[PDB]
Amino acid sequence: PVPQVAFSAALSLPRSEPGTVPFDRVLLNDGGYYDPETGVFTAPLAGRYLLSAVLTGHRHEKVEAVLSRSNQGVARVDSGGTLGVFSLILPLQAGDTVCVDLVMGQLAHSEEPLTIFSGALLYGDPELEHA
Amino acid sequence: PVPQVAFSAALSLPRSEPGTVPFDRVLLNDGGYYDPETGVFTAPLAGRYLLSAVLTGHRHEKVEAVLSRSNQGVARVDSGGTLGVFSLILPLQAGDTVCVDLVMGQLAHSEEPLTIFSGALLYGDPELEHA
Amino acid sequence: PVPQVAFSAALSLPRSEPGTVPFDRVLLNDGGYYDPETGVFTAPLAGRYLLSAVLTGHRHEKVEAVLSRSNQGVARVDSGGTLGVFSLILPLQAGDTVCVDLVMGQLAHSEEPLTIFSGALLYGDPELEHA
């Protein structure tokens, strides 16, 4: 079968938000899949996909680690402003769920950054079962 | 049909140029397609291609926006040293033409940077017509 | 035929190492292929692949240049902390070998960085012989 899925959201809101940031630029994103507000990504994709996150500079400090499914830790979108760090590929399980942790010190300053999350299907695995 | 096209030019000229910068490294680029001097890209590709631009840091200021076809604005190779910004995907029309605007303030300094422009065919769309 | 190869190693070693750095996170890498300790990449792949190296900032200086096969020089993983620089494509020969040169000054500082080396097979060439 061919699942033909792509997803890509962009953010360009005008000024100061009342809270957590949504997305208004559906650039291609037929099913929705990953809710980017809570970051709860259900991939049914089950092939090799091409992933690209946009990292906000924030030289002011604070450690950002996007938790990865099956192991915890495993910062794949890693920024230091059993466990491995990877950028290009994607050991993601079918139906499993990634979650962003943004809590690494409480003596911080208030700031709201802007984030772009693209992610397009490259290869859907075609059965690949032998006996 | 299979159009089997790739294009990728590179720049490694020795020193100070008399004007606008050409390309001597045809890395793979059978037809030529995009003239990178005037930046006039005719894509007959008409499927999904994988685009990667190389962004020169230039912290000194000046806003750089590569104009996109069909809408104007639409900075896809965006650097802030109807309208959306995208990096991974490519809504490009068949036969349409992209152009680089490099004019955002006239009280600037003279500098000549070096730029690498790759772009390879991933998927040619195979008819995809039903009735 | 279907060559079905992917390769990607990751590094998350705990602290201060006695020399050149190996890899403990085989994330997907069935044959192994490229030993990144000695940097001796044997591609039998013979196809167009998408390779991406992670560049350590190192603002302190020192010229980094990864030698490319068939020409010498030709820095493909280029960082300025007949010869061309390319990021996306790969004019690489079957069975030939790329090597990192890390020697551009002797009056420097001692440092150890951590490096992640991904590289995934996009297209295996399917004969493409006519007469």
From Swiss-Prot, chains A, B, C:
Tissue-level expression: Distributed in tissues where resilience and elastic recoil are prominent. Highest levels in the adult small intestine, aorta, lung, uterus, and appendix and in the fetal spleen, kidney, lung, and heart; intermediate expression was detected in adult liver, ovary, colon, stomach, lymph node and spleen; adult heart, bladder, prostate, adrenal gland, mammary gland, placenta and kidney showed low expression whereas a series of other adult tissues, including skeletal muscle and different regions of adult brain show no expression.
UniProt subunit comment: Homotrimer associated through a moderately stable interaction of the C-terminal globular C1q domains, allowing the nucleation of the triple helix and then a further quaternary assembly to higher-order polymers via intermolecular disulfide bonds. Interacts with EMILIN2. Interacts with EFEMP2; this interaction promotes the incorporation of EFEMP2 into the extracellular matrix.
C1q domain segment(s): 1-128
Residues of the full protein shown: 867 to 1016 of 1016
Disease involvement: Neuronopathy, distal hereditary motor, autosomal dominant 10: A form of distal hereditary motor neuronopathy, a heterogeneous group of neuromuscular diseases caused by selective degeneration of motor neurons in the anterior horn of the spinal cord, without sensory deficit in the posterior horn. HMND10 is characterized by length-dependent motor neuropathy primarily affecting the lower limbs, and onset of distal muscle weakness and atrophy in early childhood resulting in walking difficulties and gait abnormalities. Some affected individuals have pyramidal signs, including hyperreflexia.
Protein name: EMILIN-1
Subcellular location: Secreted, Extracellular space, Extracellular matrix
Miscellaneous comment text of the record: Its deposition precedes the appearance of elastin and is simultaneous with that of fibrillin 1.
